[PDB]
Amino acid sequence: PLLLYANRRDLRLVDATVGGLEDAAAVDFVFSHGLIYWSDVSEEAIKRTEFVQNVVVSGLLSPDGLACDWLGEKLYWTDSETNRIEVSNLDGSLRKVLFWQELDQPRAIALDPSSGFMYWTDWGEVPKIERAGMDGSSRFIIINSEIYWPNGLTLDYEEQKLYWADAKLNFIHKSNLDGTNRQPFALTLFEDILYWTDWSTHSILACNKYTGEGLREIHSDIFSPMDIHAFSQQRQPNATNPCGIDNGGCSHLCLMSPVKPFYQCACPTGVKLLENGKTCKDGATELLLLARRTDLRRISLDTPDFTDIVLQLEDIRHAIAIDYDPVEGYIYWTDDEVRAIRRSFIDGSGSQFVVTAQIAHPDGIAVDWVARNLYWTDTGTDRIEVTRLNGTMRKILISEDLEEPRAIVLDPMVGYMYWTDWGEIPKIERAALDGSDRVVLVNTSLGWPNGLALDYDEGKIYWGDAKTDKIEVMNTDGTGRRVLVEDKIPHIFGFTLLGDYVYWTDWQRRSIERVHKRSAEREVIIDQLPDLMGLKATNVHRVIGSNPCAEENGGCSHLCLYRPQGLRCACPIGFELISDMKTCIVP
Ligand SMILES: *[C@@H]1O[C@H](CO)[C@@H](O[C@@H]2O[C@H](CO)[C@@H](O)[C@H](O)[C@H]2NC(C)=O)[C@H](O)[C@H]1NC(C)=O
Ligand SMILES: *[C@@H]1O[C@H](CO)[C@@H](O[C@@H]2O[C@H](CO)[C@@H](O)[C@H](O)[C@H]2NC(C)=O)[C@H](O)[C@H]1NC(C)=O
Ligand SMILES: *[C@@H]1O[C@H](CO)[C@@H](O)[C@H](O)[C@H]1NC(C)=O
Numbered sequence: 001p002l003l004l005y006a007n008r009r010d011l012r013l014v015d016a017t018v019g020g021l022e023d024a025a026a027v028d029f030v031f032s033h034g035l036i037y038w039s040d041v042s043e044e045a046i047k048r049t050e051f052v053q054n055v056v057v058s059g060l061l062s063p064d065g066l067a068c069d070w071l072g073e074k075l076y077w078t079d080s081e082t083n084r085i086e087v088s089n090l091d092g093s094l095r096k097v098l099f100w101q102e103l104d105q106p107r108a109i110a111l112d113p114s115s116g117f118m119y120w121t122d123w124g125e126v127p128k129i130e131r132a133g134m135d136g137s138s139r140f141i142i143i144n145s146e147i148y149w150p151n152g153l154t155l156d157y158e159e160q161k162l163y164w165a166d167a168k169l170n171f172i173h174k175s176n177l178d179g180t181n182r183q184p185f186a187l188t189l190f191e192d193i194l195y196w197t198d199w200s201t202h203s204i205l206a207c208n209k210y211t212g213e214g215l216r217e218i219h220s221d222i223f224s225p226m227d228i229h230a231f232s233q234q235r236q237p238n239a240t241n242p243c244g245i246d247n248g249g250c251s252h253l254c255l256m257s258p259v260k261p262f263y264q265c266a267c268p269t270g271v272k273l274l275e276n277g278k279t280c281k282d283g284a285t286e287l288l289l290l291a292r293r294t295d296l297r298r299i300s301l302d303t304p305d306f307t308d309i310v311l312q313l314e315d316i317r318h319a320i321a322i323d324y325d326p327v328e329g330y331i332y333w334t335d336d337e338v339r340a341i342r343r344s345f346i347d348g349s350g351s352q353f354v355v356t357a358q359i360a361h362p363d364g365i366a367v368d369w370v371a372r373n374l375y376w377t378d379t380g381t382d383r384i385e386v387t388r389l390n391g392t393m394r395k396i397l398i399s400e401d402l403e404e405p406r407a408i409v410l411d412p413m414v415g416y417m418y419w420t421d422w423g424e425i426p427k428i429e430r431a432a433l434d435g436s437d438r439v440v441l442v443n444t445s446l447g448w449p450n451g452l453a454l455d456y457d458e459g460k461i462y463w464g465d466a467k468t469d470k471i472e473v474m475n476t477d478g479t480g481r482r483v484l485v486e487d488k489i490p491h492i493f494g495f496t497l498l499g500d501y502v503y504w505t506d507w508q509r510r511s512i513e514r515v516h517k518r519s520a521e522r523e524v525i526i527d528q529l530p531d532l533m534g535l536k537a538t539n540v541h542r543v544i545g546s547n548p549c550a551e552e553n554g555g556c557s558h559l560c561l562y563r564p565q566g567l568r569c570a571c572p573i574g575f576e577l578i579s580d581m582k583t584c585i586v587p
Contacts, residue, residue: 001190003204003218004029005197006038006227013231014204014219018049025226026066026077030090031233037075039063046077048090055092059310064107065120066227069134070236071113072243072256072263076134078106078120084307085109085120087134087255087266094253097269098136100305108164108186108227110153114239116256116263119162121150129153129164131177134256135264142177152186152196152228156209157237163187163209165196172196174209183212186228190235197225204228251279269307270300283346285541288503288512288525291322291333291494291534298346299512299526301498301537306525311348320492321365321376322534325389326543332374332389333534334362341365341376341391346540354391363406363492364419368433370412371549371560377405377419384408384419384435386559386570393558393572397435407452407463407495411476413545415564418461420449428452428463430477434561434568442474442481451495453502455517456544462497462517464489464504471504473517485515485522490532498537505532557583 003014006027011018023042029035034051039060046056046063056063061081068075068090075092078085083103088095104124111118111134119142122128129143129150143150149168156163163174165184172194174181187196194209195218204218204225229235242262247254250265257264267273267280274281284300290308294316297308311331318337324330332354334341339359344351360380367374367389375386375397383399398405403423410417410433418441421427428442428449442449447467454461454476464471466489473484488507496503501514503525509532512525548567549560556569571577571584578585 001193001195002231003188003195004036004229004231005186005204005222005225008224008226011036011038016218025062025064027227027229028066028068029229029231030068030070030073031231031236032070033090035068035090037066037068039066039077046075046092053091056086056088056095058095058312059308064227065109067109067111067118069111069113069256071239071241072134072254073241074134074253074255076109076111076118078109080105080107080123085118086269087136087253089253094268096253096266097305097307099132099139100307108151108153110155110162112155112157113256114157114237116258119153119155121153121164123149133258133264135266136255137257137259137264143175143180152184152188154188154194156189163189163194167199170199183209186225188228188230190230190232195228195230197222197228249278269305269309270298270303272302283540285539286498287324287346287538287540288496288498289322289324289331289536289538290512290532291319292316292529293318293531293533296322296331296333296348301501308526308529311344311346313344313348313351320361320363320533323365323367323536324538324540325367325369326538326540327369327372328389329540330389332365332367334359334365334376336361341374354389355387355394357394364408366408366410366417368410368412369543370546371433371553371562373559373561375408375410375417377408379404379406386561388559395559395570395572398431398438407450409452409454409461411454411456412547412549412562413456414476415547415562416476418452418454420452420463422448428461432561432563432565434563434570436563436568441477448489448491450489450491450493451504453495453497455497462495462502464493464495466491466493471502471515484517485520487513492533494532494535496535496537498539501537503535503537505535509533555582 006024025041026039028037037048039046041062044060063079065078084100086097104122107121109120116134119131130141132139153164185197195206203220206216243254248263253266255266265278270284284302286301288299290297296311320334322333341355364377384397386397387394406420408419417431426446430441431438451464459476469488470483471485474481494505511527547562549562554560559570561570575584576587
């Protein structure tokens with residue numbers, strides 16, 4: 001029997017007589033494919049190697065359990081810090097959060113693919129051992145009576161038994177699901193011999209698995225046993241995959257199950273499973289996009305787990321404002337340090353720069369998904385600019401008589417552009433999409449207007465205010481002013497609307513609350529996630545409306561700027577219209 005144990009900076013084998021890492025807590029293998037997976041609590045990662053590759057980095061905090069399904073070819077792990085258990089394919093793709101609720105400090109995990117069951121421990125105020133289906137079916141609590149700091153769960157498939165230790169009560173028990181025999185950090189099995197690692201001897205102790213007698217010593221001097229396993233093919237019994245030729249018709253994940261056909265079709269986190277029961281939707285249909293200062297994250301509003309997948313993006317340093325075009329599936333954000341605006345997909349792939357030049361404090365960004373333009377406000381230079389989503393055709397759209405412009409939004413199908421203002425006399429303004437008809441919409445009871453949402457469906461606009469700590473609702477002209485909620489407002493404020501709910505950031509920028517725009521009910525969605533800056537709730541599919549600009553750029557040689565009264569073509573900096581008001585020249 002060879003024994004594989006997570007050291008911490010090292011990974012190594014012991015007998016019967018991978019290095020250069022910082023804090024390993026867990027280890028596993030798929031002997032058939034010759035793979036070895038480990039977890040790093042300091043590096044915040046899970047990697048693999050053959051006899052290195054990144055597998056899960058996209059946001060862990062302390063993952064201590066790690067188990068490989070060799071039959072469904074899936075990787076299961078637990079994060080004691082984030083209070084959730086997750087599954088993924090062997091290389092990390094198609095990642096799914098199996099559990100998240102009623103979880104304290106999930107530690108060790110072990111699998112039984114043929115039966116399709118998982119097992120794990122809780123290290124909270126209420127420590128426990130619980131099992132469920134490999135598909136997250138039927139959560140069942142098994143051990144509650146007398147345990148504190150349980151760890152190193154191991155199963156004997158040859159004799160249908162479950163072993164474990166207790167790093168606080170110094171026993172090694174055995175059971176199965178019920179009936180319990182009493183017979184130490186991590187532990188494993190091989191044939192007749194159960195090997196464990198002792199908190200106070202720093203050696204690998206071994207004993208009989210039926211009686212216990214013969215308390216032999218395997219290897220001394222072993223200081224760090226963060227996890228321990230038996231490295232043998234026979235530790236992973238063979239079975240045919242019940243999924244078969246092709247994922248049992250699953251479009252994505254085919255996970256082992258205890259019941260029915262003994263396989264269950266699953267979808268990655270957030271995304272829903274169709275009437276089919278085998279095919280996923282093409283991603284989540286409803287997204288809450290999130291701009292932290294240094295990361296960028298997404299929350300599906302399709303599922304009640306609200307899990308913020310980190311976007312795989314490089315160099316976010318001081319992000320501020322965010323928005324998204326549904327037509328191309330593009331995310332656009334701004335960065336107060338890099339002094340630029342960036343592009344990318346939900347994935348975080350295809351990352352590109354959109355604008356790099358004369359930007360100071362781009363506190364507001366807005367996509368026009370009809371005319372295919374992009375607007376932003378700049379508190380620094382004190383002007384509202386517009387390009388195309390590309391970043392070309394840059395034109396200064398409002399500059400004179402504008403001080404401290406902040407949040408910006410557009411109503412392309414109507415022809416309206418709304419923004420907030422500070423300075424000498426703060427206000428909410430409206431113009432046509434070419435800066436024309438600049439009119440003041442709200443004049444009084446404003447201090448620091450911070451965020452604007454449009455309720456396109458119901459002719460409403462929403463805003464919030466730093467100084468007055470109020471979030472107000474109003475008609476998009478013909479007023480119906482009303483303060484919907486009363487709460488403190490962050491200087492930089494992530495404000496967004498979609499559906500029947502309204503998303504915003506709390507004072508400390510530590511949490512995102514939503515409010516049912518109609519009623520009043522406030523439920524905190526995400527917690528414990530600092531440095532929130534900006535938000536955009538959006539329907540990735542649904543694209544509402546159109547105007548004449550959507551066809552052949554309204555016959556304009558550069559910018560198509562839509563008024564409710566018609567349409568005017570526009571020109572970049574240095575350009576000028578010719579005799580016909582449709583073509584721009586360099587005079
Ligand atoms: C269980 O046993 C079968 C039959 O021996 C294994 O056969 C393997 O087939 C795959 C391709 O299907 C080859 O890559 C391997 O070389 C075969 N293994 C051997 C030992 O010859 C089958 O893979 C086994 N099941 C699992 C899940 O690995
Ligand atoms: C970004 O750039 C492309 C390519 O420059 C633009 O494509 C224009 O598209 C129309 C088709 O209706 C052509 O007639 C123009 O000749 C193209 N313009 C140029 C300058 O080449 C387009 O503006 C942008 N892309 C998208 C998808 O909107
Ligand atoms: C805005 O406020 C100023 C100063 O009180 C006032 O003169 C003006 O009439 C107001 N505008 C509107 C549209 O009410």
